[PDB]
Design an enzyme around this catalytic site. Structure first.
Site, short mmCIF file in Angstrom:
data_model
loop_
_atom_site.label_atom_id
_atom_site.label_comp_id
_atom_site.label_asym_id
_atom_site.label_seq_id
_atom_site.Cartn_x
_atom_site.Cartn_y
_atom_site.Cartn_z
N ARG A 297 30.09 38.26 33.35
CA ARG A 297 30.04 38.88 32.10
C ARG A 297 30.94 38.26 31.36
NH1 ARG A 297 29.03 43.79 31.28
NH2 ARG A 297 27.85 42.48 29.39
N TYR B 220 38.86 44.95 38.14
CA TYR B 220 38.58 46.20 37.79
C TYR B 220 39.63 46.94 38.86
CZ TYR B 220 34.96 46.08 34.47
OH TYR B 220 34.11 46.00 33.34
N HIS C 128 34.38 41.98 28.16
CA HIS C 128 33.93 43.08 27.51
C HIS C 128 34.86 44.39 27.85
CE1 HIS C 128 32.42 43.56 31.36
NE2 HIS C 128 32.30 44.77 31.29
N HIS D 32 34.02 48.48 28.04
CA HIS D 32 33.22 49.74 28.11
C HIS D 32 33.44 50.88 27.17
CE1 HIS D 32 30.68 48.14 31.35
NE2 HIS D 32 31.70 47.76 31.91
N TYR E 172 33.98 38.37 34.26
CA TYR E 172 33.68 38.68 35.61
C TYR E 172 32.36 38.16 36.04
CZ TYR E 172 33.20 42.49 38.97
OH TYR E 172 33.20 43.12 40.26
O1 INO Z 1 25.34 46.22 35.92
C1 INO Z 1 26.06 45.63 36.61
O2 INO Z 1 25.82 45.22 37.59
C2 INO Z 1 27.59 45.37 35.97
C3 INO Z 1 28.57 44.57 36.71
C4 INO Z 1 29.90 44.30 35.98
N1 INO Z 1 30.11 44.80 35.06
O3 INO Z 1 31.23 44.55 34.59
C5 INO Z 1 29.20 45.40 34.30
O4 INO Z 1 29.49 45.78 33.04
C6 INO Z 1 28.03 45.59 34.71
C1 CYN Z 2 31.42 47.65 34.58
N1 CYN Z 2 31.42 47.70 35.67
FE FE Z 3 32.20 45.73 33.34
#
Ligand code: INO
Ligand code: CYN
Ligand code: FE
Ligand code: INO
Ligand code: INO
Ligand code: CYN
Ligand code: CYN
Ligand code: FE
Ligand code: FE
Lengths: 200, 233, 233, 200, 233, 200
Positions: free
Chosen positions: E154, E105, E157, E159, E144
């Site tokens: 993860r 990211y 995905h 968002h 990720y």
């Molecule tokens: O809730 C989390 O900790 C989290 C971490 C990484 N991503 O990509 C998410 O969408 C959520």
């Molecule tokens: C998605 N953090």
């Molecule tokens: Fe995320």
């Protein structure tokens, strides 16, 4: 293994319990005979006392729609099961918390001692069943008296509560209300100082 | 006085609704976090009041007359009280209460907009007979909107209280009507995890007990904890 | 000394019983409310003791002799200790403990009314062999009543503890016996959500290992977390 | 995806864990050789210390049946896995809380520094696994020392704990016992000041 | 200004993930313990912003041009936004964010070892059309690793944030890719109890919308709370 | 019964929500037009206020990756739905807590009174929606002003909250920042003094 017929599942009493079990409180006309909070007539043997308390929820807020049922031995340590308004003493009673103050009262006599299945005497106690909205299955408890310290120490029932500090939760505090001997017994449904509830 | 002669079959706390059932919001703050403390049955728990001598009014069990005729679905609600062994529970106190036909309760706290019925009180009581049979005459209550989720509605239901032989058997529950679409939606109903247990709370239409050209009938049997004698104690 | 050459398959926390399992009363007050903090494996976590040189007594693993002959069903409890890759765990420490034939424990705090067995202690230990095999000789323990619900009984069970190659592998569990009707009622057993996981705790009758006219035998294999070599680290 | 054989499910140690792992405590005869609470012999190089503490449940009540296993480096920051009662120092030990006082004790040496898989040094620490009735699966934690403040600030493990306030639950407090260097390490299983537990 | 002319179908809180889903560690401390307070819909709840006049850049919805060409699988993510009645939601705001091809990211707090992509930002926005259609052009994000359990990843995905006609319909979710095996393993995904709901989150391969010799396309329809007129209020 | 299409399920905004909804905060270049925390241009009618607060978790720890959205009527109790960076006033806004201090701020005007569906007026309020990592479905709340005490006591919404103590959690505490009227509004997601969250 063997299975019997299954017991009818319980359901909360609901906020309107009163219409069915505490007519007065519901604010409805009562019938000739009503099961209420006066277990003893003035002329009943034993030490006449008044019981009072409040009910608290998990947030420390008063539970003002609670319904309680009590069962206790007479002054002689005897269970008077034949319920009759003519009786000087009835082992069974009913009460509820005021929608205002949220306090319940009971007029009775200090119960005499009774022995457990194994012949051991239990400290004087009142058996309580608590019902209310948000309660799916009624909660069982016992009210013991703080001035029966000696008996209390040896109570086979009280002694099953692993943590001594939790035992303290079942002890009513002796006080005076209008110069009358009274015991205050607050119930903490959840959280800090949560009252011991029994399964039997 | 009463005597310690019986033992009652231990409750099945997985059958009954648990204490904390989040969908039913009020249960959140009104459930213990500490485990129930198990105790042996003694005289205190194995005895209870007998209502044989209570003075019952002539219409105690007739909600059609105990409060003009009420408007709504004339029904008889009857059934039998037996213990887990199938043994009848004679002379036991059955008490019931409900809302009127529109879903309004004759209670201070009920603010629901459906009107009260001038000829309806909503309370009934009676003692089971020698065969453990009871019967009440009333009107079928209506569903009730309540503040739980934003659009929660209680299925038409009648509240019941049953004494039994001991405080160990004392029960408070609710009866629902066969085929009511609201049932499967009710968070209160849902407090009960076993669909099979759910079925125990549904009164069944009973055409054999109906009064032709008069009133229909519903059957609702209640089962209380099995009562056995102590042995080798 | 010990060296960081290995990595261990990450535990499946949904496989293992979770911390808070309310029907097992004690778990309520003894389960953390905060989430576990995950941490990378380091030498600290990927090493552990080797019991090769522990001085074992001649009857360490023979409960019939290590304490007269005990009263009870004479059995042999044997099996193999492998990792998740199917690889045998040799020279590992296996410790077991249990109640007697009547379900009585030789422990201060055991107030159960079933008597002690003069010739029974209830402790055994041994090292797995080169093939990862171990074996004990004991008597089949009895079920035991305990203060949880008002009528709860632990299935007959043997407590086991296994070291493995590191502290990441160290496990404490319980062996249950094939066909025991109490198994399915136990809240301790039931702390395990997956019925398939429950099956792993069930020792199987093993006629092939029995000593005819002497003692039966049960088979109980143990799977420790898989061990792999670090790569591209 | 790929699946291996599933690991054998854990189960609580039970209340009688002592019969099996802490013979003495069980009040039973011990065997010739037992794995106990004295990791170092008087003649072991390093700083000889005494570890002690209590274990608390979610209600703040003592957990008197807890069983603990420790794993630490020697004074040189070396893991000695070859367990032998003949050794002057063993990296492995066992202890348990008294049924009375509810306190455990360990006799060892302050461990030397060890590096993570990535080459960064960890503050001196003792690996601890907790077992007891009510505990389905054992809890993993670490004991760090208050006199290693400089080291603790830089520990990559301690730094993994998101909330700085939680980090302090892992630090043992130095004192003296019978004029000996001691560290007190209390584990709070649940609630207020709940001890950090790890998964690896 | 806005007018209270609509009611929105009540949310199904057993469809959406609950607040406390302990496997997703962070939900533990970030979930309310008290129950939600249900309130009737007022103009406050039934209105929300209209983004018709927002000044969108030319490449607002084109992640390939809006930040060289990004490295990664070129795709078009498109679909329709309708209400529960199946009615399209025209001119509504859809915003999306995601990591690069390697699961990295472009955010201060992301310390994942996979490199940033010089030609990639990871943010897009656009307004649905008359028909409730939306479309973005981007690259397929990579999985990720995150600090949940010791080996959590993860699934790839994207968002998504959707405004809809009012604050009552506003929603934030995630799109997942058809057939990714990480899907059923994710604790965030598993926050959703109903497998059927999970399914609504999977974007399906859409060959019909692909640009031959250029990019693939995925189809992701979005369903907002049903909107109906008030009646007998 | 009748079933409609199921709404698409929610998921947590995630830790990197800023990349998408709070560009600056992510530390990335913004676009020409961004939805941010300035609802009112200095020359907009009404009483200009500065709003700020912190967000706490069940452990009392600051939630530094929170993201909030607001919706309120203008000083005349009107909702301006046509969003435009040109308007002197926008009913809709976005904000987020600092990775450091962990405080959020919003620049607006105190809202006018709006009536509920029944025609009864609500005390002046700001509709808030909270998103963040660990938050599966956004939480809804309302910010009320401590200086509108009179209004507050009669709000049909506030009145729906059963316990009076819980209502207090919705009241912003007036103050002054740089000689400007400021209202502090802390959000306690869980535990002691947990803020009331709504469903609609
Ligand atoms: O809730 C989390 O900790 C989290 C971490 C990484 N991503 O990509 C998410 O969408 C959520
Ligand atoms: C998605 N953090
Ligand atoms: Fe995320
Ligand atoms: O528990 C409640 O809140 C509730 C409300 C209304 N009725 O009719 C019930 O039976 C129960
Ligand atoms: O966890 C307990 O309380 C318990 C009691 C008795 N036995 O035998 C166990 O194995 C466990
Ligand atoms: C219903 N009360
Ligand atoms: C069992 N202990
Ligand atoms: Fe009701
Ligand atoms: Fe055991």
């Amino acid at each position: 293994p063997i299975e019997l017929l299954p017991e009818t599942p319980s359901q909360t009493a609901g906020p309107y319990v009163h219409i069915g079990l505490a007519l007065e409180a519901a604010g409805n006309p009562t019938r000739d005979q009503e099961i209420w909070n006066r277990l003893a007539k003035p002329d009943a043997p034993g030490e006449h006392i008044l019981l009072l308390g409040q009910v608290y929820d998990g947030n420390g807020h008063l539970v003002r729609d609670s319904f309680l049922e009590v069962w206790q031995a007479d002054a002689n340590g005897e269970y008077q099961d034949a319920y009759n308004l003519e009786n000087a003493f009835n082992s069974f009673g009913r009460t509820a918390t005021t929608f205002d103050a949220g306090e319940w009262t009971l007029h009775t006599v200090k119960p005499g001692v009774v022995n457990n299945a194994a012949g051991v005497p239990m400290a004087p106690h009142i058996n309580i069943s608590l019902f209310a909205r948000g309660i799916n299955i009624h909660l069982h408890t016992r009210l013991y008296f703080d001035d029966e310290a000696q008996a209390n120490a040896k109570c086979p029932v009280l002694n099953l509560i692993e943590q001594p500090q939790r035992r303290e939760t079942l002890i009513a505090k002796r006080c005076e209300v209008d110069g009358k001997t009274a015991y205050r017994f607050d119930i903490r449904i959840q959280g800090e100082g949560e009252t011991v509830f029994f399964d039997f | 006085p009463a005597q310690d002669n019986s033992r009652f079959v231990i409750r099945d706390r997985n059958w009954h609704p648990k204490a904390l059932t989040p969908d039913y919001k009020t249960s959140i703050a009104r459930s213990p976090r500490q485990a129930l403390v198990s105790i042996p049955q003694s005289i205190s728990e194995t005895t209870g009041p007998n209502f044989s001598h209570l003075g019952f009014g002539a219409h105690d069990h007739d909600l059609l007359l105990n409060f003009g005729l009420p408007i709504g679905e004339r029904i008889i609600v009857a059934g039998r009280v037996v213990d887990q062994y199938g043994k009848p529970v004679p002379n036991t106190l059955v008490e019931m209460w409900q809302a009127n036909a529109g879903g309004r309760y004759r209670h201070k706290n009920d603010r629901y907009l459906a009107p009260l019925d001038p000829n309806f009180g909503g309370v009934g009581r009676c003692l089971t007979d020698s065969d453990g049979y009871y019967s009440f005459r009333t009107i079928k209550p209506g569903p009730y909107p309540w503040r739980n989720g934003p659009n929660d509605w209680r299925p038409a239901h009648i509240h019941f209280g049953i004494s039994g032989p001991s405080i160990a058997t004392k029960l408070i529950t609710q009866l629902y009507f066969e085929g009511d679409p609201l049932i499967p939606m009710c968070p209160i109903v849902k407090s009960i995890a076993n669909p099979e247990a759910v079925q125990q709370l549904i009164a069944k239409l009973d055409m054999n007990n109906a009064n032709p050209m008069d009133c229909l009938a519903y059957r609702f049997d209640i089962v209380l904890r099995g009562q056995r004698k102590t042995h080798f104690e």
